Structure 1
Amino acid sequence: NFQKVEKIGGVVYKARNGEVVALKKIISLLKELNHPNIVKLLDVIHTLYLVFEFLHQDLKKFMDASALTGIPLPLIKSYLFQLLQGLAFCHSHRVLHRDLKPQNLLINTEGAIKLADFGLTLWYRAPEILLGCKYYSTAVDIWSLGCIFAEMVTRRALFPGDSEIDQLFRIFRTLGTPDEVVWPGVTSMPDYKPSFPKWARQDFSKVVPPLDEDGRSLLSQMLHYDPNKRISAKAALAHPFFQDVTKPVPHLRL
């Protein structure tokens, strides 16, 4: 039914129906849900295939293309604001993403960005997932988005771990080793070990330097250890960081 065009990255292909779509080779309630910052799910076929609307670039490629100059702050702010709108919608319908990362974030020439590749490589994982919590919450997505925010600002991954424990210890070295004071119940997590090294929390203005105090404040709330203290998508949208948000159009080379 579909003329393959190319492989995007189960497997995902750009395909032609004359509609151009993204065809994923490996739910139906999601087809009826609609938000400007969420990729549209067009079809489900089980004979498992998912058919999605097609967008031409992802944030990972755009950040690489922007590496030598960086993404302008107004565009970083617009993208973060839009991604939070998408998450606030998802979370209000009790849908988690669980695997947010720059290559899952799709952009177009109009200035829009959309959530894709839902989890329905460790760099964006929330600490409660790494510590073995089985019933994690909408807060895991806010953590991932905070990591992506930091990466847009600094042009380097915040926590580029190469193993589960290296990921955890990279988080601890920056944010401090969590304890019961800042995260009640952390020492009862399934994979918590009393033998974890105890690192002090680094000064936060060292971590995303050029970012102003509004952005650092928001980031800090997105990276709270306690999922119950971590800011919600809805509350983040009201943060003073977004008082001057606009929707710039990006320079895309396709």
Structure 2
Amino acid sequence: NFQKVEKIGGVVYKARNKLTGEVVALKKIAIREISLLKELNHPNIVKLLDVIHTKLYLVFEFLHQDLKKFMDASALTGIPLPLIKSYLFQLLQGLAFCHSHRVLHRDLKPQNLLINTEGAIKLADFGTLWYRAPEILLGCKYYSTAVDIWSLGCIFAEMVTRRALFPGDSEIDQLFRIFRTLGTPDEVVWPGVTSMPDYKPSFPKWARQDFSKVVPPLDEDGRSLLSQMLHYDPNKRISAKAALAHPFFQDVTKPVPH
């Protein structure tokens, strides 16, 4: 039925549908979540074409490559700001759509963001440590859409600087890397943080970095938006919908990537 072409990322393969000649991404691995997922159409969400239960196989549209590869390829010169802005804007549209339908992504990272030759970018693999929100790291079981905004913020910073923002090697290292940059959170900035399941009063108390240093040479509009995406308190973190109205996107366009 499907011929595997190569492994590209459960497990995901490039494959040919012999019944249609279509080239697809085939993921080899509750039904309600998938239903909701399947019914969604948006230009910035990878389309789920078919679900085959026999092991569960999810058949997705196939896209050119992922943003990780593009960023590695662009590491020498960087991604031009207009393209960064376009990608961020598009990802926020996708998230705004998902979130309005009560769908969380929860594992956003460059490897899960797929691009095409025409300037589009799409969200894929709906649910490393590097893009995990602090509330998840502190043991929150009942987290919100805000976890996706944190992750996208980390990705935004990485596109700009050509370095991962918080490349932890363990959950505690991840948390402490966050704390060393943004300051150790307290009840003032994050009411309720000290009652979180894995919060320990013995966490070292670091001061916040002046931030100027975190994503140079991003302009103040960009820094403003990023800071709103990285608020500790998930309830203060900007929503995708509001982020779309941020002045950073006043001059947004849709360039064609190299």
Does the 8 A contact of 1:127 with 1:168 survive in 2? yes
Task: Output the CA distance in 2 between the equivalents of 1:172 and 1:235.
Answer: 26
Does the 8 A contact of 1:159 with 1:167 survive in 2? yes
Task: Output the CA distance in 1 between the equivalents of 2:22 and 2:75.
Answer: 33
TM-aligned CA deviation for residue 69 of structure 1: 0.2
How many residues of Structure 1 are paired with residues of Structure 2 in the alignment? 249
Task: Output the CA distance in 1 between the equivalents of 2:39 and 2:125.
Answer: 17
TM-aligned CA deviation for residue 29 of structure 1: 2.9
TM-aligned CA deviation for residue 80 of structure 1: 0.1
Does the 8 A contact of 1:133 with 1:190 survive in 2? yes
Deviations 1:79-99 (A, max 9, x none): 000000000000000000000
Deviations 1:95-118 (A, max 9, x none): 000000000000000100000011
Does the 8 A contact of 1:28 with 1:44 survive in 2? no
Task: Output the CA distance in 2 between the equivalents of 1:216 and 1:51.
Answer: 38
Deviations 1:25-72 (A, max 9, x none): 0x1232221000000000111111100000011000000000000000
Does the 8 A contact of 1:150 with 1:219 survive in 2? yes
Deviations 1:215-250 (A, max 9, x none): 000000000000000000000000000000000000
Task: Output the CA distance in 2 between the equivalents of 1:30 and 1:60.
Answer: 24
Task: Output the CA distance in 2 between the equivalents of 1:29 and 1:202.
Answer: 41
Other structure's SS at 2:159 match = helix
- 5+ residue gaps, structure 2: 29-33
| Equivalent runs, 1:156-235 vs 2, <5 Å | 156-235=163-242
Does the 8 A contact of 1:84 with 1:234 survive in 2? yes
Task: Output the CA distance in 1 between the equivalents of 2:211 and 2:147.
Answer: 21
Of 70, 93, 97, 1:89 maps to 97
- Structure 1 residue 4 and structure 2 residue 4: aligned? yes
Task: Output the CA distance in 2 between the equivalents of 1:140 and 1:217.
Answer: 18
Match of 2:111 in 1: 103
Q: What is the Cα-based RMSD across aligned positions, in Å? A: 0.5
TM-aligned CA deviation for residue 137 of structure 1: 0.1
Match of 2:88 in 1: 80
Deviations 1:113-149 (A, max 9, x none): 0000111x10000000000011000000000000000
Moved more, 214-223 or 43-52: 43-52
Percent sequence identity is 100
User: Post-superposition, which runs of at least 4 consecutive aligned residues in structure 1 deviate over 6 A?
Assistant: none
Other structure's SS at 1:85 match = helix
TM-aligned CA deviation for residue 174 of structure 1: 0.2
Other structure's SS at 2:224 match = helix
Other structure's SS at 2:148 match = helix
Structure 1-normalised TM-score?
0.97
Deviations 1:7-41 (A, max 9, x none): 0021100000000000000x123222100000000
